[PDB]
Design an enzyme around this catalytic site. Structure first.
Site, PDB file in Angstrom:
ATOM      1  N   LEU A  35      24.703 -35.419   4.516  1.00  0.00           N
ATOM      2  CA  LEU A  35      24.056 -35.446   3.208  1.00  0.00           C
ATOM      3  C   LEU A  35      25.102 -35.227   2.151  1.00  0.00           C
ATOM      4  O   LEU A  35      26.044 -34.438   2.345  1.00  0.00           O
ATOM      5  CB  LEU A  35      22.960 -34.377   3.148  1.00  0.00           C
ATOM      6  CG  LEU A  35      21.933 -34.519   4.276  1.00  0.00           C
ATOM      7  CD1 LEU A  35      20.847 -33.495   4.032  1.00  0.00           C
ATOM      8  CD2 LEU A  35      21.321 -35.912   4.233  1.00  0.00           C
TER       9      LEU A  35
ATOM     10  N   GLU B 140      15.767 -27.602  -1.000  1.00  0.00           N
ATOM     11  CA  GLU B 140      15.296 -28.979  -0.712  1.00  0.00           C
ATOM     12  C   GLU B 140      15.060 -29.065   0.808  1.00  0.00           C
ATOM     13  O   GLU B 140      14.020 -29.571   1.251  1.00  0.00           O
ATOM     14  CB  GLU B 140      16.305 -30.047  -1.187  1.00  0.00           C
ATOM     15  CG  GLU B 140      15.676 -31.441  -1.471  1.00  0.00           C
ATOM     16  CD  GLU B 140      15.148 -32.161  -0.204  1.00  0.00           C
ATOM     17  OE1 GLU B 140      15.883 -32.199   0.833  1.00  0.00           O
ATOM     18  OE2 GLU B 140      14.023 -32.691  -0.204  1.00  0.00           O
TER      19      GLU B 140
HETATM   20  N1  NDP Z   1      16.810 -37.975   3.075  1.00  0.00           N
HETATM   21  C1  NDP Z   1      18.100 -38.071   3.127  1.00  0.00           C
HETATM   22  O1  NDP Z   1      18.850 -37.894   2.162  1.00  0.00           O
HETATM   23  C2  NDP Z   1      18.614 -38.501   4.517  1.00  0.00           C
HETATM   24  C3  NDP Z   1      19.901 -38.962   4.675  1.00  0.00           C
HETATM   25  N2  NDP Z   1      20.333 -39.324   5.973  1.00  0.00           N
HETATM   26  C4  NDP Z   1      21.664 -39.850   6.061  1.00  0.00           C
HETATM   27  O2  NDP Z   1      21.446 -41.206   6.477  1.00  0.00           O
HETATM   28  C5  NDP Z   1      22.752 -41.669   6.991  1.00  0.00           C
HETATM   29  C6  NDP Z   1      22.493 -42.377   8.329  1.00  0.00           C
HETATM   30  O3  NDP Z   1      21.768 -43.602   8.117  1.00  0.00           O
HETATM   31  P1  NDP Z   1      22.067 -44.775   9.115  1.00  0.00           P
HETATM   32  O4  NDP Z   1      23.554 -44.891   9.250  1.00  0.00           O
HETATM   33  O5  NDP Z   1      21.300 -45.946   8.698  1.00  0.00           O
HETATM   34  O6  NDP Z   1      21.639 -44.172  10.442  1.00  0.00           O
HETATM   35  P2  NDP Z   1      20.303 -44.058  11.280  1.00  0.00           P
HETATM   36  O7  NDP Z   1      19.966 -42.617  11.477  1.00  0.00           O
HETATM   37  O8  NDP Z   1      19.316 -45.035  10.806  1.00  0.00           O
HETATM   38  O9  NDP Z   1      20.818 -44.401  12.769  1.00  0.00           O
HETATM   39  C7  NDP Z   1      21.151 -45.811  12.953  1.00  0.00           C
HETATM   40  C8  NDP Z   1      21.139 -46.068  14.391  1.00  0.00           C
HETATM   41  O10 NDP Z   1      19.918 -45.529  14.938  1.00  0.00           O
HETATM   42  C9  NDP Z   1      19.233 -46.581  15.708  1.00  0.00           C
HETATM   43  N3  NDP Z   1      18.110 -47.362  15.026  1.00  0.00           N
HETATM   44  C10 NDP Z   1      17.749 -47.272  13.744  1.00  0.00           C
HETATM   45  N4  NDP Z   1      16.741 -48.065  13.482  1.00  0.00           N
HETATM   46  C11 NDP Z   1      16.412 -48.626  14.659  1.00  0.00           C
HETATM   47  C12 NDP Z   1      15.446 -49.542  15.019  1.00  0.00           C
HETATM   48  N5  NDP Z   1      14.567 -50.015  14.095  1.00  0.00           N
HETATM   49  N6  NDP Z   1      15.396 -49.922  16.304  1.00  0.00           N
HETATM   50  C13 NDP Z   1      16.236 -49.482  17.215  1.00  0.00           C
HETATM   51  N7  NDP Z   1      17.201 -48.630  16.891  1.00  0.00           N
HETATM   52  C14 NDP Z   1      17.294 -48.204  15.633  1.00  0.00           C
HETATM   53  C15 NDP Z   1      20.401 -47.472  16.143  1.00  0.00           C
HETATM   54  O11 NDP Z   1      21.030 -46.692  17.108  1.00  0.00           O
HETATM   55  P3  NDP Z   1      22.011 -47.323  18.389  1.00  0.00           P
HETATM   56  O12 NDP Z   1      23.277 -47.812  17.584  1.00  0.00           O
HETATM   57  O13 NDP Z   1      21.980 -46.174  19.308  1.00  0.00           O
HETATM   58  O14 NDP Z   1      21.319 -48.693  18.848  1.00  0.00           O
HETATM   59  C16 NDP Z   1      21.176 -47.538  14.844  1.00  0.00           C
HETATM   60  O15 NDP Z   1      22.506 -47.953  15.099  1.00  0.00           O
HETATM   61  C17 NDP Z   1      23.601 -40.409   7.238  1.00  0.00           C
HETATM   62  O16 NDP Z   1      24.492 -40.179   6.122  1.00  0.00           O
HETATM   63  C18 NDP Z   1      22.616 -39.279   7.137  1.00  0.00           C
HETATM   64  O17 NDP Z   1      23.262 -38.188   6.528  1.00  0.00           O
HETATM   65  C19 NDP Z   1      19.542 -39.256   7.110  1.00  0.00           C
HETATM   66  C20 NDP Z   1      18.248 -38.735   6.947  1.00  0.00           C
HETATM   67  C21 NDP Z   1      17.798 -38.415   5.652  1.00  0.00           C
HETATM   68  C1  IXG Z   2      18.711 -35.185   8.017  1.00  0.00           C
HETATM   69  N1  IXG Z   2      18.344 -33.948   7.381  1.00  0.00           N
HETATM   70  C2  IXG Z   2      18.783 -32.762   7.901  1.00  0.00           C
HETATM   71  C3  IXG Z   2      17.865 -31.796   8.282  1.00  0.00           C
HETATM   72  C4  IXG Z   2      18.293 -30.554   8.783  1.00  0.00           C
HETATM   73  C5  IXG Z   2      19.655 -30.269   8.925  1.00  0.00           C
HETATM   74  C6  IXG Z   2      20.595 -31.222   8.508  1.00  0.00           C
HETATM   75  C7  IXG Z   2      20.158 -32.461   8.016  1.00  0.00           C
HETATM   76  C8  IXG Z   2      17.534 -33.971   6.277  1.00  0.00           C
HETATM   77  C9  IXG Z   2      17.657 -33.000   5.234  1.00  0.00           C
HETATM   78  N2  IXG Z   2      16.880 -33.009   4.130  1.00  0.00           N
HETATM   79  C10 IXG Z   2      15.925 -33.957   4.023  1.00  0.00           C
HETATM   80  N3  IXG Z   2      15.187 -33.920   2.902  1.00  0.00           N
HETATM   81  C11 IXG Z   2      14.195 -34.800   2.780  1.00  0.00           C
HETATM   82  N4  IXG Z   2      13.492 -34.701   1.615  1.00  0.00           N
HETATM   83  N5  IXG Z   2      14.003 -35.817   3.701  1.00  0.00           N
HETATM   84  C12 IXG Z   2      14.736 -35.960   4.846  1.00  0.00           C
HETATM   85  N6  IXG Z   2      14.480 -36.927   5.810  1.00  0.00           N
HETATM   86  C13 IXG Z   2      15.748 -34.969   5.001  1.00  0.00           C
HETATM   87  C14 IXG Z   2      16.544 -34.949   6.155  1.00  0.00           C
END
Ligand code: NDP
Ligand code: IXG
Length: 206
Positions: free
Chosen positions: A25, A32
């Site tokens: 993140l 949050e």
């Molecule tokens: N709310 C927030 O601000 C959030 C931010 N993040 C951030 O998001 C970023 C990661 O996003 P991203 O790189 O897109 O990673 P994802 O977590 O989407 O992981 C991507 C991988 O997961 C699998 N995958 C995803 N979608 C599918 C699907 N539809 N079908 C099959 N497999 C799938 C594949 O794995 P494989 O390669 O094993 O096939 C793909 O290569 C990170 O920086 C993380 O910090 C994450 C959650 C929340």
């Molecule tokens: C990935 N993530 C996380 C959660 C716990 C610890 C480290 C990272 C995280 C952390 N914060 C989040 N906040 C919102 N609003 N939505 C999400 N899907 C979020 C996901």
């Protein structure tokens, strides 16, 4: 016997749809995360006798969580990957798609099982978010809007708060956010380590 429950997406994003940096993140916002944890964990009192929520996440998101915080505690975690490998797993479910997850979930936690599913959340990956936005069951976004163009290298895949999507996605009243969520939720801008952010809830008719 699958498409009974809607899905909810929860995300924290910048005004330019930034969600991610070097596989983590791009902020550190303890309150949050508290909101994320309460929202994804919340089950109505009557039902928490056996019900739990589900967090579905991409494999890169799963790898992004500090080991101390896996599996996300008090929720059923399911990791989506195309590679049926090994997330060496406590009880760490794995599926090759968002639909394979739901099938696995309904099979595993059936109307007979000891643990019963309440709500189902998609928590990220951009790549998994993309699949969720395309899913006919997804009808709700719990968005945390962060009012800073924080440098990111991963973006939420669909501009749901933009004009072009405004006939499909509608932002709900803050009182409607509260009771869906089941608690008092701060309204308006919150300030934690330098950025303003705020809690939103958007919906899309099925
Ligand atoms: N709310 C927030 O601000 C959030 C931010 N993040 C951030 O998001 C970023 C990661 O996003 P991203 O790189 O897109 O990673 P994802 O977590 O989407 O992981 C991507 C991988 O997961 C699998 N995958 C995803 N979608 C599918 C699907 N539809 N079908 C099959 N497999 C799938 C594949 O794995 P494989 O390669 O094993 O096939 C793909 O290569 C990170 O920086 C993380 O910090 C994450 C959650 C929340
Ligand atoms: C990935 N993530 C996380 C959660 C716990 C610890 C480290 C990272 C995280 C952390 N914060 C989040 N906040 C919102 N609003 N939505 C999400 N899907 C979020 C996901």
């Amino acid at each position: 016997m699958n498409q009974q429950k809607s899905l909810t997406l929860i995300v924290a994003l910048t005004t330019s749809y930034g969600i991610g940096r070097s596989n983590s993140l791009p902020w550190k916002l303890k309150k949050e995360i508290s909101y994320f944890s309460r929202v994804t964990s919340f089950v109505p009192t009557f039902d928490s006798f056996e019900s739990m929520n589900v967090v579905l996440m991409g494999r890169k998101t799963w790898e992004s969580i500090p080991l101390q915080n896996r599996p996300l505690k008090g929720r059923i975690n399911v990791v989506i990957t195309r590679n049926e490998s090994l997330d060496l797993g406590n009880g760490i479910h794995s599926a090759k798609s968002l639909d394979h997850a739901l099938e696995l979930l309904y099979r595993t936690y059936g109307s007979e099982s000891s643990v019963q599913i309440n709500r189902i959340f998609v928590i990220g990956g951009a790549q998994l978010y993309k699949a969720a936005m395309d899913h006919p069951k997804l009808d709700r976004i719990m968005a945390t809007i962060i009012y800073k163009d924080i440098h990111c290298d991963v973006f939420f895949p669909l501009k749901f708060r933009d004009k072009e999507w405004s006939s499909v996605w509608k932002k709900e009243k803050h009182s409607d956010l509260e009771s869906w969520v089941g608690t008092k939720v701060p309204h308006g801008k919150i300030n934690e380590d330098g950025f303003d952010y705020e809690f939103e809830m958007w919906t899309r008719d099925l």
